């Protein structure tokens, strides 16, 4: 019911292609977004979710839309053939978020971190600092091979909203056989 626009950032880098998760990472993201996108619209029928690919560039494949069909359909042919750039991904997701057609929805972002992020620790925190000022809650969930609970990533979520913040979770998924059930249990119903 909480009016919020979920700008889901789905990874499509090359490492996203090795299936430490049973069938493949992508289906995990592709299955995962299926629930997060569906989770938000079910919670509130006035909601809207868009997706930003994060590898090799920051494409905006589907702008912020309520209809979940477009997000699901666009997921296909996501073609994981790039290198993740999370430094810019959040900005473009937020900058696109700033174009919210309705100005009332709260802000909530879901990032699909599935590759090793090569970002200076100082840069990530400064990005987090800009998010704090502008009151956007972003959830980070990690997939596939990556320095488990990257220190750069973990510092990001903590400064994301601390001092008794909303708790934009850095939900770390158990690598190995696991569906979005971990991604749906904790983050999807509570972010």
């Amino acid at each position: 019911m909480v009016l919020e626009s979920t700008m889901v950032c789905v990874d499509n880098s090359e490492y996203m292609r090795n299936g430490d998760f049973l069938p493949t990472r992508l289906q995990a993201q592709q299955d995962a977004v299926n629930i997060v996108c569906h989770s938000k619209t079910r919670s509130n029928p006035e909601n809207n979710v868009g997706l930003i690919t994060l590898a090799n560039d920051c494409e905006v494949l589907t702008t912020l839309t309520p209809d979940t069909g477009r997000i699901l359909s666009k997921l296909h042919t996501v073609q994981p053939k790039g290198k993740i750039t999370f430094c810019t991904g959040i900005r473009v997701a937020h900058l696109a978020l700033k174009h919210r057609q309705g100005k009332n929805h709260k802000m909530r972002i879901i990032a699909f971190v599935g590759s090793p992020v090569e970002d200076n620790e100082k840069d990530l925190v400064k990005l987090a600092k800009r998010l704090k000022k502008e009151k956007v809650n972003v959830d980070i969930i990690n997939f596939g091979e990556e320095e488990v609970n990257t220190e750069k990533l973990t510092a990001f979520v903590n400064t994301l909203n601390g001092k008794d913040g909303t708790g934009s979770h850095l939900v770390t998924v158990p690598p190995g056989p696991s569906l979005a059930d971990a991604l749906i249990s904790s983050p999807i119903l509570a972010g």
Partner: protein
């Protein structure tokens, strides 16, 4: 108080459009829109950006940017008009304001009304106030009461339209 022939735009404020940035969870935006002691505070810094949206194009005469006398009341207010997209803090300082206002202590009092240049605000559809400091230089600023006084501009709502005279299926 209010001037002759002008009415507060509280009824005209679009709850959907309005959104604050840096608003603290405990004291939110809705608090400063009520004529109560309930107020709004900025969580992450003294800078705050409180935007509002009006149902139909309104005109602006005098806003009452009241603030607590503890020193956390607003000090420097930058107003923008009809912003196509929400504003960014970094880009908000850069851009030139429609009317750069230096609040004085007399204004922040409960009875203080700050006059705006009526000429510049003639077709405002959404106004964004940017509090750049509080009087006491406190960690968080506060807006006790904040609303706009003007007149409503009659807007042609084409959504209604609807034929009023004539018969359907008639050509030139």
């Amino acid at each position: 108080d209010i001037p002759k022939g002008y009415m507060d735009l509280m009824p005209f404020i679009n709850k959907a459009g309005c959104e604050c940035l840096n608003e603290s969870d405990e004291h939110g935006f809705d608090n400063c829109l009520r004529k109560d002691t309930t107020f709004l505070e900025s969580d992450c810094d003294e800078q705050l950006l409180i935007t509002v949206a009006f149902n139909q194009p309104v005109k602006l005469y005098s806003m009452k940017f009241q603030g607590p006398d503890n020193g956390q009341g607003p000090k420097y207010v930058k107003i923008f008009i009809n912003l196509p997209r929400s504003m960014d803090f970094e880009e908000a300082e850069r851009s030139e304001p429609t009317q750069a206002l230096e609040l004085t202590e007399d204004d922040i009092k409960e009875d203080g009304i700050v006059p705006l240049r009526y000429v510049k605000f003639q077709n405002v559809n959404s106004v964004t106030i940017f509090v750049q400091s509080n009087q006491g230089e406190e960690e968080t600023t506060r807006i006790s009461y904040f609303t706009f006084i003007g007149t409503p501009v009659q807007a042609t709502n084409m959504n209604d339209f609807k034929r009023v005279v004539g018969k359907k299926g008639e050509s030139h």
